[PDB]
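Researcher: Batch entry, complex prediction.
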Amino acid sequence: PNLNIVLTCPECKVYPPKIVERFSEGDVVCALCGLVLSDKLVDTRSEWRTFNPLLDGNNLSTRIGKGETTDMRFTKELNKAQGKNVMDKKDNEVQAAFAKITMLCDAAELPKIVKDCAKEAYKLCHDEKTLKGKSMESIMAASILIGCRRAEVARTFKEIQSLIHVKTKEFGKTLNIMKNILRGKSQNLTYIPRFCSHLGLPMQVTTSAEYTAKKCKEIKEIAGKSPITIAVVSIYLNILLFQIPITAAKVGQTLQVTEGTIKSGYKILYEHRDKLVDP
Amino acid sequence: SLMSCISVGTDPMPIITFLSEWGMEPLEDYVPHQSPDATRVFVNGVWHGVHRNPARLMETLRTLRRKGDINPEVSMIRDIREKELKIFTDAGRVYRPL
Amino acid sequence: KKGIAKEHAKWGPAAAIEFEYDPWNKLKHTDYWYEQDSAKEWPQSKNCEYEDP
Amino acid sequence: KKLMAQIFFGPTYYQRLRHMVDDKIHARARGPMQVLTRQPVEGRSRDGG
Amino acid sequence: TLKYICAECSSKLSLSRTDAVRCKDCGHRILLKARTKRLVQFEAR
Amino acid sequence: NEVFSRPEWMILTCLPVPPPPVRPSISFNESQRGEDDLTFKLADILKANISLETLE
Amino acid sequence: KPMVNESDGVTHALYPQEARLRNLTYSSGLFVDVKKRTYEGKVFIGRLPIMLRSKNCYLSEATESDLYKLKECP
Amino acid sequence: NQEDSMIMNQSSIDRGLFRSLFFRSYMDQEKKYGMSITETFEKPQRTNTLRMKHGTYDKLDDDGLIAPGVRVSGEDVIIGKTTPISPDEEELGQRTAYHSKRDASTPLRSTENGIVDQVLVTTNQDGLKFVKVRVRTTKIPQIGDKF
Amino acid sequence: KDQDDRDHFGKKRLDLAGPLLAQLFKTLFKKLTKDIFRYMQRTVEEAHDFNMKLAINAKTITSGLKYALATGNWGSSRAGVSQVLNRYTYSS
Amino acid sequence: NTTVLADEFIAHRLGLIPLQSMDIEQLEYSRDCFCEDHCDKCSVVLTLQAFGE
Amino acid sequence: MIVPVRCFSCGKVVGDKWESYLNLLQEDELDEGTALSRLGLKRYCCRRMILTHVDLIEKFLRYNP
Ligand SMILES: [Zn+2]
Ligand SMILES: [Zn+2]
Ligand SMILES: [Zn+2]
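Model: Structure tokens for the complex:
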């Protein structure tokens, strides 16, 4: 069949066409020979203005509801009838899960972007004997982690682990294979301003902190083994710099780090703070 | 109209309470034959009893509203011919100054 | 640039140009609308004196 | 030449309204058509008919 | 990197991508366009 | 009229499918592809056709 | 009082002029104290759009000069 | 002037009488779908991008915006917006040479003209970089206007 | 007595933004509680953890009213309550 | 331009500014010159620098 | 919005007349009709212009640049 149409000026035919499209006159014209190739060009503008296609695809279902010309016996008749055919698809989990993440990201005020970004993660895998279930929650929240990270932001695991408790062991373990599945199907830098956000300080702290954060890892000090701990250590030796009292008492209740990590990380970074005088 | 304003509504409790203390004979004990010339009292279109000397009652009320004792947005009407006295404190009435 | 008012009003060498003839309406070029008498109502022009009554 | 009749004259407040001509005049000679019916589209902004 | 203007600061910003969308010396959050250096031409006719 | 109107035909047995022009695909930006209600309804009926097929 | 939770998650006071430009919604949050009981502190519940010049708006009683500072016509 | 028509002194028009300004605000935004397709604000070029509007583009800066204070005519690309697409997706004609993205710009109304007053860039609630554009134009009183 | 004229203005009331938000907010708050009951039921049902963040849906209210003001919808049942401000002229 | 006034607005007002023009005949009509958009015998070039201090 | 150039009907350059006019009231406390007599717009195609102009540009400058 080959089912293809490609415009070609019969008088010239010099190449794959070098032509133009006079949208206002609704035609297409040979830019050299001037012959009108095809006319009655059709608008496609006003069609979509009146108007999930990303994830489910051609699996179709139409949201419905009662009518005005309808009795109460017609109202709850439809509400009972609208659920008797939900068996035909196994997107019911998805239609609850996509609802659930929609409840999830929005409730903790995630940007609407993460809503689809997390949706992208779940629909990506949705089935693997490596998952074979897997508590049904990592596929939600680790998808958000996959979503939010893909949404170019990130939150600490506790902010999500306490948000969704999956014992954190199989949660992360099944989380990792999602990246492998991501690679098979194919980062503290954003944690900076959010941390100072809840404490309400001016804007110049972060870059000053970011300069300090950059220096620690490059020379030495893998610093954490799960180095999420030293994300705060980047910050605290900056709040130790300035005179606003936010001592580890307030950070420990806000950022939730044990002073065993805070004091140890602070002092070992007091050794190398000599090379850390920017201004 | 340029002078118009809309009533925001208040709590009617003071008036009704105040009404009882000024001779509003409670409706539960009302005996129409025994007081044929009573003046029915309404508050936001809710009958709350009857009275017997409305003229004493009426100008007493307005004075309170003018004293600021009753919030000025509260509208009250004495309808002589109907033996009916009405009071409104509803939210959304249309009123103008005069 | 050297322009002429007929194009645009910016090149206007002149302002309001007063202009009048026949101050007394003796040429009958105009009929004076009036309620009781034109003379009592229509004021005389500033130049009416400059010509004979 | 003097006007035979007099004129009522004097200032008066005047206001300008939205309906400028340039936002009301249009023409069409074989422009685009709709997709459903292939009759010409409506709306001067979208080059209506 | 093209010139922008802070929303109140009226500060030269001359920035590119991967820059903190913000004004130097003041954390302002909106950027103007810092009009072109090629001249305009008019007719008051 | 036994040549054009047999009351037996008054009861639908095989419903026809209108070609795309009757129910054009609202294709916007190659991804925001809207479809007319009839497109969905034909799919929607087809599902209600699908279930009753196998369910019995 | 009105404020906005931005993309990162930071929440800062929102001014009406900014709202119009950045397509924001001049709202403020709601917070309710909840008492929970088991028988034999403050909880956020949502936002609320605020009428401009209302008692709670930042423009409630600002100075004329201050209004010019906030770029809002008196 | 019959039938509610008028007769307006030409010179008074020439002296600014009933002259007035006009300000149109064009705003556009890039929307990513699943953080896979990335709508982009940049100056498109008639060579490396496909299916582009036949208006001129040079009034754009590098980032796809028109510098303010620049006179513009109708059918001129105010905002340079592009959308990546899969090279082997539809094969809508010439896609086998570009492979990059297609034009999705927002030109000026063909019937409008004037000077771009100011252009601002900012983000929505969700950090999406977008831009509003304001166009200034003087509307001289003319024959058809309604008073 | 005459037939009661129902076009009399005294029999009319005007519902401004205050009451209009109230009744619209009244329902929105109601739906919030019912949902909070659902989460409260399941945790008692299944001895699960009880998280207020999980219990309370933030975007019920906010995304409720925002849409409720974006379009004149007050639910059908009402139209044209909200109009974009007409800034043609200061008088307008 | 950083005024609170539109460009053409200011430009239009600049047009309505009268200039001494006694020897206007000593200039050449703008279209008559073969000049490149102007010339010393065809036009007068005026500049203005104003700065709020 | 700011002292229009010459009156539309007549054309007497009227831009310079503004501040002098303003100088009159705040200093000599004249009546406007008497003021213009001192000012010198004896016709009334201009006598309108200064009388009914609005100085909006003053309120404009209240916005810090
Ligand atoms: Zn050809
Ligand atoms: Zn010359
Ligand atoms: Zn004059």
